[PDB]
Design a protein around this nucleic acid. Structure first.
Ligand SMILES: *O[C@H]1[C@@H](O)[C@H](n2cnc3c(=O)[nH]c(N)nc32)O[C@@H]1COP(=O)(O)OP(=O)(O)OP(=O)(O)O
Ligand SMILES: [Cl-]
Ligand SMILES: [K+]
Ligand SMILES: [Mg+2]
Ligand SMILES: [Mg+2]
Ligand SMILES: [Mg+2]
Ligand SMILES: [Zn+2]
Length: 675
RNA sequence: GUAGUAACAAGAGGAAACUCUGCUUCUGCC
């Protein structure tokens, strides 16, 4: 049965107005949407029947919500079906929509169906429900769909579906004051054609009985007093930069580094430098290859050292050292050219000293010490605690897992780890979460942002944000993982900037709530005028952007010639194969480590530059239709060279190239083989 | 193959308000 605040939240939409339902995670927004659906079904005009679509951004959420809708509505005689990437290829989308009263989807399913001409109008629906609707920005599938809706609205020749958006946070964007915050919220509202914002106003006491906002503890801790590990690695980085400058004057290509080793700024500098180094053009093409390859190696090595410094700041020296020894093992097992041998030798000269450091107990990381004390204190107090420990990077989560496995909390608590997909598969993710829910001693989950929201996780008594910073929306989401009476959320940092960020979040969240209240005081006319003027601005920008050559592909590492754009064919808008016997000379293959079928293709092999001194990954080979071992190239593996000007360019997406490429044609293909 | 007003920014335009830009970190999706 419905809580009073749920009935309250539904009211603006029960009248047929487009509504944005902003309420805390776990407050039952999906149930509110179900109330709205029930009213919708029962009050259609004569001659009409409803057709509802519920959109979710993540597969596990799609699965969760599909089950909820089936259970609620099938018993009332409604057909409820789901489509996601798991079954998209096994079904006809048009046919599922024809046969279903309610369809639950991931939004790309609908985008693909407009793209392929299966669907021609959103007037096929009477109600569209967007879960996590704050994701409606840019080229997100939600905004691709809403752009289509708004184009229909503008043409004013069709009945639009009602729109319902669900979110726990409208956010603040880059706003610094209430005026800017109102503007940000109205922008989000404009993209979804919202007509009213629905929050709990009358039944706040009831809401507060069900939803307890976690108690925050921001703890500022110290760095190590002395940092000999960082000194040794820093010196190796200085030496590597100097070596790089003897190979080629990198300053004529990208600016000189600030030598701010062990920072994200340095990481970014390396990456920008790598981008510039691969585009180096020389008249002597052999020299271009030699220099580009050498610079590729030097920058990769600098990156790994920088990574190790960052790991050492948050975890143990032995975790940083480990990361490096695993890298150097890979280096030894690869092309392992003379430059690679030299860099490896320079590391191995210092490795004894680094090992000795990694064992000295006076070198312990105080931040990690704080973390262990926090966890000890919590489990000692309440042995039934379940904790979610958030950390930013895969490398740090992996290090923390090792720490907590080797040194169990109170000598018995065991960690599980949740990361994003490669990586971990959705089945793997669910397995870890099942164990964390039920296990007697597995009471600690260490996770990246995969755990912020969406996927079902057991409620946690303790949420620890280990150097885990972000915006207002992220802090609202992570809070919702620790939703119970008695729950705590602790942020642990050695950075005064992170403390200040969290202070700003508190202020901004207050600003957001106030902005919403001010908007809610506007009458319908005022609100609609504001949203309309934003939509017309949007349109004028979109329309202006719409009205607004042959290349060789070169190996992105060694600059060897790969193929011509003339040789490429596009399969199903996405997959770029290369035709002809000539290309076969250019690459070599190894069996694919995860040979699987998707999109009608069977993966066979990985494809590499044939140069043993290079071995750069170029893509895969696949079986498709009547053809085996077709090479599928990935654009990020190559540099493009204009045959007209000789100029080299970097493309991270196929968009700007595809226009110039031919589509796959089964007849053309069939002719390239003996009869 | 692709997305994110996410992470971290850094830089460019502007008198300023503020606009544009990332392939890195992380996650999502087909
Ligand atoms: O350029 C890509 C693309 O054409 C296709 N491909 C690979 N992964 C995906 C995917 O998740 N979704 C879609 N639609 N298409 C995909 O193969 C080409 C080659 O890419 P990779 O070399 O990355 O292929 P894979 O992941 O199999 O190899 P690796 O990443 O293990 O090295
Ligand atoms: Cl909810
Ligand atoms: K070769
Ligand atoms: Mg309407
Ligand atoms: Mg930030
Ligand atoms: Mg891949
Ligand atoms: Zn190569």
């Amino acid at each position: 049965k419905a809580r009073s605040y749920q009935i309250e939240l539904a009211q603006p939409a029960i009248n047929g107005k487009n509504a944005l339902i902003c309420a805390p995670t776990g407050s039952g927004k999906t149930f509110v949407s179900i109330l709205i659906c029930e009213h919708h079904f029962q009050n259609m005009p004569a001659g009409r029947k409803a057709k509802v679509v519920f959109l979710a951004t993540k597969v596990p959420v799609y699965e969760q919500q599909k089950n909820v809708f089936k259970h609620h509505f099938e018993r009332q005689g409604y057909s409820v079906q789901g489509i996601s990437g798991e079954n998209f290829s096994n079904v006809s989308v048009e046919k599922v929509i024809e046969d279903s009263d309610i369809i639950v989807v991931t939004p790309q399913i609908l985008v693909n169906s407009f793209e392929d001409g299966t669907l021609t109008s959103l007037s096929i629906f009477t109600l569209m429900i967007f879960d996590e609707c704050h994701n409606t920005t840019g080229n997100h599938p939600y905004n691709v769909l809403m752009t289509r809706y708004l184009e229909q609205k503008f043409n004013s020749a069709s009945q639009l579906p009602q729109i319902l958006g669900l979110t726990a946070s409208v956010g603040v964007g880059n706003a610094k004051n209430i005026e800017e915050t109102i503007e940000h919220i109205c922008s989000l509202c404009s993209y979804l054609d919202i007509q009213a914002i629905s929050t709990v106003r009358e039944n706040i006491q009831e809401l507060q009985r069900f939803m307890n906002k976690p108690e925050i503890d921001v703890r500022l801790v110290k760095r190590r007093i002395h940092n000999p590990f960082a000194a040794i690695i820093s010196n190796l980085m200085s030496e590597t930069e100097a070596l790089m400058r003897t190979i080629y004057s990198v300053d004529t290509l990208s600016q000189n580094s600030k030598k701010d080793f062990g920072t994200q700024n340095y990481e970014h500098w390396i990456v920008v430098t790598q981008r510039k180094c691969r585009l180096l053009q020389l008249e002597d093409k052999e020299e271009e290859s030699r220099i580009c390859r050498a610079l590729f190696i030097c920058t990769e090595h600098l990156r790994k050292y920088n990574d190790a410094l960052i790991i050492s700041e948050d975890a143990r020296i032995i975790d940083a050292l480990s990361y490096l020894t695993e890298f150097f093992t890979n280096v030894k097992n690869g092309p392992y050219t003379e430059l690679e041998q030299h860099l490896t030798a320079k590391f191995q000269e210092k490795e004894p000293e680094l090992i000795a450091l990694s064992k000295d107990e006076t070198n312990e990381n105080p931040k990690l010490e704080e973390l262990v004390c926090i966890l000890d204190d919590a489990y000692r107090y309440n042995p039934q605690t379940r904790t979610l420990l958030f950390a930013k990077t895969r490398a740090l989560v992996s290090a923390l897992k090792k720490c907590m496995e080797e040194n169990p909390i109170l000598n018995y608590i065991k960690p599980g780890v949740l990361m994003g997909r490669g990586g971990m598969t959705l089945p793997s993710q669910k397995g870890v979460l099942d164990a964390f829910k039920t296990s007697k001693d597995n009471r600690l989950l260490i996770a990246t942002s995969v755990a912020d929201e969406g996927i079902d996780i057991v409620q946690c008594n303790l949420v620890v944000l280990y150097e885990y910073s972000g915006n207002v929306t992220k802090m609202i989401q992570v809070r919702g993982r620790g939703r119970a009476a008695g729950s705590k959320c602790i942020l642990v940092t050695s950075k005064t900037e992170v403390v200040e960020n969290e202070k700003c979040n508190r202020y901004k969240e207050e600003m957001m709530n106030k902005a919403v209240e001010k908007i809610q005081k506007w009458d319908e006319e005022t609100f609609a005028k504001k949203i309309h003027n934003l939509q017309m601005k949007e349109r004028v920008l979109r329309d202006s952007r719409r009205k607004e050559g042959q290349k060789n592909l070169l190996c992105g590492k060694c600059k060897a010639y790969a193929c011509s754009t003339d040789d490429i064919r596009i399969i199903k808008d996405s997959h770029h194969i290369v035709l002809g016997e000539a290309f076969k000379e250019r690459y070599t293959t190894k069996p694919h480590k995860k040979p699987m079928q998707f999109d009608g293709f069977e993966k066979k092999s990985k494809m590499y530059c044939r140069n043993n001194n290079c071995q750069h990954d170029w893509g895969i080979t696949v079986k498709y239709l009547t053809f085996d071992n077709l090479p599928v190239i990935k654009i990020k593996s190559f540099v493009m060279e204009s045959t007209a000007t000789g100029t080299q360019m970097d493309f991270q997406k196929w968009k700007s190239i595809n226009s110039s490429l031919k589509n796959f044609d089964v007849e053309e293909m069939s002719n390239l083989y003996p009869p």
